[PDB]
Paper text:
Like other members of its family, [name] consists of an N-terminal nucleotide binding domain (NBD) and a C-terminal substrate binding domain (SBD), both of which are connected by a conserved hydrophobic linker. The data presented above reveal that [name] biases [name]’s conformational equilibrium towards an ATP bound-like, domain-docked state that is predicted to weaken substrate binding.
To facilitate crystallization we deleted the N-terminal nine unstructured residues from mature Chinese hamster [name] as well as a large part of the flexible helical lid (SBDα) at the C-terminus, a deletion that favored crystallization of the ADP-bound G. kaustophilus DnaK. Additionally, we introduced a T229A mutation that strongly inhibits the [name] activity of [name] and favors FICD-mediated [name] over ATP hydrolysis. In the crystals [name] adopted a domain-docked conformation. Accordingly, the interdomain linker was well structured and bound to the NBD by parallel β-augmentation. However, the nucleotide-binding pocket in the NBD of [name] [name] was occupied by several water molecules and a sulfate group was found at the position where the γ-phosphate of ATP would otherwise be located. Although the crystalized [name] [name] was clearly ATP-free, it adopted a conformation that is characteristic of the ATP-bound state. In particular the conformation of loop L7,8, harboring the [name] site residue T518, differed substantially between both structures. Second, additional electron density extends from the T518 side chain hydroxyl group, consistent with the phosphodiester linkage to adenosine.
Numbering used by the authors: 28 to 517, 521 to 548
Write the structure that this text describes.
């Protein structure tokens, strides 16, 4: 059928379709070309998704869910998850070592959701938006992820797609999608394009070469827990502390107070993109008292300056990894909602010695636009023109060798799909199982990198230590997701079992079925 492109964002999502020779970004039922990544359950049992969910946050905060993009593919004990919990009104509980979400779905009835199920609801809303515009069912999609997403975050996004009843044909890295929006139909030779992608929750920088519809990522780097949400938390914290100093009272555990502050902080941030001061006004803030304060642009900037400045380190790294200087950059493409912040634009400009970013790019839509073009290509639409993408893995994959040392299998910035094979053997006589832990990251020792998964090579026939010869192949697919397989080089196929913190097959089937009821 008609394959859609969905930008699944932390705070906002966007859907496009390639039709009649061009991309159309599809407006939702309220006329908005972006939709809040919010879900809510009214006290009466109505499920709200998008604008309606966000609009009732302050009256029903404990049963309004958002920020799921910063919870998927993470463990409960991740310090980033524990940071966000302080500013999230909904209950987050540990289940299967992961942050699950508990809400009241109506009439006092508790329900627990995996964060993938929240993202599935958002994807369902984006699918419905496209279906209303197209006048037909949508079964297939290209869905975006941050370039710096790890394996678990990628797989969790695909699982969200599955739970939404979508066949996710391709997971596309956000800056790659944005590069397509910039570069589609340009015949300007080969150019070095830097995409600076700072959204509601994640930060990516990618350097690409673009040449007449051929897009190649040379290097990428970022931080999947740096964006708008962090800047909002800094301002919320400022005003929580301001109230503490004024009254002596702590509002941090009052969800109504904190989320009313969130609403106002969002509006102020938007206003401060064009004004130098904004008013924070809350009628019934805490214990019958109102809240009435000013936020200057200078204060907003001061509260966030360390975070704003931290965005230049990934830019530095991508230039080094690509063997390019600042002066080799032909265009700077700014995408993501946080690139509307004047100070962010100034810092990027100053970092590039006064160079102006590319005009004609809406930072809220460019990623969706690119996703819709790639969806057009995967639908066989010739009006997209020749469109070739070469993308990379963001993180070095490795294994542990003697001394806790990170030993490389596949280095960062390798074009995918790619594979690496290695022979493994046993450490003791008659050992029936060999366990291999795979890590993601650039640090010297495995303990300072991220555990991707534990893989057990099982059914190894009895033999003396060191005699078995098992060739394990580690393959990263075009989506950026790892598959591990094994062959006895001495019955050829070796059964591998893995633990990668993924939703179980039973979970996914149950969650798919539950979603179909809505």
């Amino acid at each position: 059928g008609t394959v859609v492109g969905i930008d699944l964002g932390t705070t906002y999502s966007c859907v496009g379709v390639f039709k009649n020779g061009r991309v159309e970004i599809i407006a939702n039922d309220q006329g908005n070309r972006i939709t809040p990544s919010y879900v809510a359950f009214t006290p009466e049992g109505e499920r709200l998704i998008g604008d309606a969910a966000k609009n009732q946050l302050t009256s029903n905060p404990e049963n309004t869910v958002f920020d799921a993009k910063r919870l998927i593919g993470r463990t409960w004990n991740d310090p980033s998850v524990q940071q966000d919990i302080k500013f999230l009104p909904f209950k987050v509980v540990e289940k299967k070592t992961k942050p699950y979400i508990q809400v009241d779905i109506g009439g006092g009835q508790t329900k627990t959701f995996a964060p993938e199920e929240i993202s599935a609801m958002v994807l369902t809303k984006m699918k419905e938006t496209a279906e209303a515009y197209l006048g037909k069912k949508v079964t297939h999609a290209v869905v975006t992820v941050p370039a710096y997403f790890n394996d678990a975050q990628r797989q969790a996004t695909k699982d969200a797609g599955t739970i939404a009843g979508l066949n996710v044909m391709r997971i596309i890295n956000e800056p790659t999608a944005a590069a397509i929006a910039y570069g589609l139909d340009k015949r300007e030779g080969e150019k070095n394009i830097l995409v600076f992608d700072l959204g509601g929750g994640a930060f990516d920088v990618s350097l690409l070469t673009i040449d007449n519809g051929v897009f190649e990522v040379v290097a990428t780097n970022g931080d999947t827990h740096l964006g708008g949400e962090d800047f909002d938390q800094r301002v919320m914290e400022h005003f929580i502390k301001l109230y503490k100093k004024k009254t002596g009272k702590d509002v941090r555990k009052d969800n109504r107070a904190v989320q009313k502050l969130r609403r106002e902080v969002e509006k102020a941030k938007r206003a401060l993109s064009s004004q130098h001061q904004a008013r924070i006004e809350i009628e019934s803030f805490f214990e019958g008292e109102d809240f009435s304060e000013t936020l200057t642009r200078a204060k907003f900037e001061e509260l966030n300056m360390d975070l704003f400045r931290s965005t230049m380190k990934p830019v530095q790294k991508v230039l080094e990894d690509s063997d390019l200087k600042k002066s080799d950059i032909d265009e700077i493409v700014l995408v993501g909602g946080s690139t509307r912040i004047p100070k962010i634009q100034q810092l990027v400009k100053e970092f590039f010695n006064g160079k102006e970013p590319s005009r004609g790019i809406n930072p809220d839509e460019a990623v969706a636009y690119g996703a819709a073009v790639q969806a057009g290509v995967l639908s066989g639409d010739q009006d997209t023109g020749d469109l070739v993408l070469l993308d990379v893995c963001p993180l070095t994959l490795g294994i542990e060798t003697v001394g806790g040392v990170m030993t490389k299998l596949i280095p960062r910035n390798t074009v995918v799909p790619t594979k690496k094979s290695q022979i493994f053997s046993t450490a003791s006589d008659n050992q029936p199982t060999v366990t291999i832990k795979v890590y993601e990251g650039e640090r010297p020792l495995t303990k300072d990198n991220h555990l991707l998964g534990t893989f057990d090579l099982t059914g190894i026939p009895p033999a003396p230590r060191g005699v078995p010869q098992i060739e394990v192949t580690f393959e990263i697919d075009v989506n950026g997701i790892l598959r591990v397989t094994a062959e006895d080089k001495g019955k050829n196929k070796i059964t591998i079992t893995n633990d990668q913190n993924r939703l179980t097959p039973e979970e996914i089937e149950r969650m798919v079925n539950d979603a179909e009821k809505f």
